[PDB]
Every structure is written in structure tokens, then in C-alpha cells.
Amino acid sequence: DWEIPDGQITVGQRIGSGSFGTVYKGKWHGDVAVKMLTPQQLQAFKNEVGVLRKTRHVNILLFMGYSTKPQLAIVTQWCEGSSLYHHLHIIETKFEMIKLIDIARQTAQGMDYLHAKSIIHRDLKSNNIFLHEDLTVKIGDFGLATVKSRGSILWMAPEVIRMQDKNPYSFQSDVYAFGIVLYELMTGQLPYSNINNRDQIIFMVGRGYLSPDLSKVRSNCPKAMKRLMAECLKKKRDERPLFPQILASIELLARSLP
Numbered sequence: 001d002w003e004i005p006d007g008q009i010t011v012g013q014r015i016g017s018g019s020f021g022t023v024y025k026g027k028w029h030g031d032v033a034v035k036m037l038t039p040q041q042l043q044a045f046k047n048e049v050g051v052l053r054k055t056r057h058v059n060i061l062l063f064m065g066y067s068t069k070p071q072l073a074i075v076t077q078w079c080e081g082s083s084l085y086h087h088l089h090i091i092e093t094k095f096e097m098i099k100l101i102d103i104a105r106q107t108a109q110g111m112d113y114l115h116a117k118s119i120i121h122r123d124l125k126s127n128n129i130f131l132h133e134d135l136t137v138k139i140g141d142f143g144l145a146t147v148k149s150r151g152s153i154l155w156m157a158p159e160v161i162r163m164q165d166k167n168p169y170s171f172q173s174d175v176y177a178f179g180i181v182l183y184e185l186m187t188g189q190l191p192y193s194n195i196n197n198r199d200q201i202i203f204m205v206g207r208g209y210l211s212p213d214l215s216k217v218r219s220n221c222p223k224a225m226k227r228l229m230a231e232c233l234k235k236k237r238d239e240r241p242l243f244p245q246i247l248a249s250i251e252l253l254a255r256s257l258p
């Protein structure tokens with residue numbers, strides 16, 4: 001099994017909380033990430049998502065094992081560096097166009113893998129794309145439904161925001177969230193920056209009145225990159241390309257660049 005013997009993990013600094021559980025930097029055969037959760041949270045993740053079992057890919061965060069005592073936790077590999085969100089919006093890292101294209105290429109590579117294994121991320125955003133050693137993209141923080149009837153909206157597809165569906169999530173919703181990530185890479189900015197109201201952004205994006213300002217893309221951004229971005233951000237989910245097609249477009253772009 002993947003159960004780490006009781007008392008082997010040293011738990012350190014609290015990193016934060018994602019879709020589910022609290023992340024702490026830890027030590028177990030070097031630096032590791034320790035995601036604390038409840039047995040109900042762990043069982044739901046194994047059923048509703050199942051990335052711990054299913055994924056073993058260079059662009060997906062590597063699961064390592066779990067602990068039962070003192071507290072239940074998922075132990076993954078540790079990413080040395082920062083998330084794409086942190087790089088672009090917190091510390092304003094100026095990446096070369098070649099690198100920005102590579103980050104997109106690597107993200108689309110990981111997404112195509114997940115989708116081929118029939119896994120929908122449901123919560124892809126820039127603080128989920130971890131730039132390990134500032135070179136390798138590692139996709140983590142998978143979406144898990146923790147709440148019922150009776151949050152980062154900038155990446156949500158209009159249909160996800162409208163939520164007139166029980167499960168508005170699809171491969172196409174992840175394509176939209178990737179579209180926003182492409183926007184962030186090519187502009188170095190977050191969409192709808194000129195609006196100071198979360199409710200107005202939610203209402204308008206869902207109703208298709210508001211969409212990212214594509215005129216904000218860098219001068220050195222390839223025409224095909226801006227074209228792919230537009231296709232991924234289509235308001236009609238059906239009009240969006242899937243990741244095998246997205247990947248092929250980036251891979252072709254990556255070589256056609258002088």
C-alpha cells in the first residue's frame with residue numbers, strides 16, 4: 001500500500017487551502033507537500049476525482065503516499081518555486097515569449113493526459129499551475145465538491161457561472177479555464193481589471209456580455225496564439241477545441257517561432 005508508517009512525516013509551514021484540505025510544507029525523504037483532510041474528503045476525492053490512483057505524468061503533481069496518524073493527510077512531491085499566478089501577478093516575472101509558449105505547451109500536455117484518462121480538473125487556475133524549478137509545469141489542486149444546496153470566478157466558463165446545470169463541468173469548461181491562463185501568459189494580467197465588482201463580473205461573464213480584452217496581448221504574441229486563445233474562450237462550450245487539438249496548435253506554434 002501507499003501508507004506512510006506512523007510518525008515519519010515532519011509537518012512545517014502552512015502554505016494554504018485549495019478546493020479541499022489544508023496544505024503544509026513537510027519533510028519525508030526530503031521536501032514534501034502535506035494536504036490535511038477528513039476521511040469523508042479523502043473517500044470523495046478517490047470516487048469523484050481519483051487522480052491519486054490514475055495519474056503518473058511529468059506535468060501532473062506526483063502523489064507519494066498517505067498518513068493516518070497523527071492526522072489523515074495526502075503526501076505529494078514538493079514544488080520548488082512558485083505558481084504561475086504568483087509569477088505573473090505577485091512578483092511580476094518577465095518570461096521570454098518562448099518560455100510563455102512552453103508553459104502553455106506543458107499545461108496543455110498535462111490537461112490532454114487528464115482528459116484522456118477521463119479526468120476533469122473542475123478548478124484550473126494560475127495558482128494551480130506550479131512552476132517546479134521554474135521549468136516544469138505541475139498541475140495540482142483538483143476541484144472537489146465540498147458543499148451542497150439548502151471562490152476564483154475569473155477562470156469559470158459562462159455555463160459554470162450560470163450553473164443552470166447540476167454538473168456544468170466538462171472538458172470544454174477546463175478548455176475555457178486554460179483559455180484564461182493563456183490570456184494571463186500573453187498579457188501578464190488578470191481579465192476584467194477595469195471592473196471593481198465581483199457580482200457584476202459574475203453576472204456579465206455568465207450572460208456573455210463580458211469577455212477578456214484580447215487587444216491587451218503582447219506585440220510579440222503570435223497570431224495563431226491569439227487565435228487559439230479566442231477559440232478556447234468561446235462562450236458556446238461546443239465551439240471550443242479539445243486538448244488534443246489545443247496541443248497540436250501550440251506544438252506547431254513552438255517550432256514555427258524564430
Ligand SMILES: CC(C)(C)c1nc(-c2cccc(NS(=O)(=O)c3c(F)cccc3F)c2F)c(-c2ccnc(N)n2)s1
Nearest residue numbers: 016017018023033035061063074077078079140141142
Ligand atoms: C495552497 C495551494 C495553493 C492550494 C497549494 N496546494 C498544493 C497541493 C498540495 C497537495 C496536493 C495538491 N493537489 S491535489 O490534492 O489535487 C493532488 C493530490 F492529492 C495527489 C496528486 C495530485 C494532486 F494534484 C496541491 F495542489 C500545493 C503544493 C504542492 C506541491 N508543492 C508545492 N510547493 N505546493 S500549494
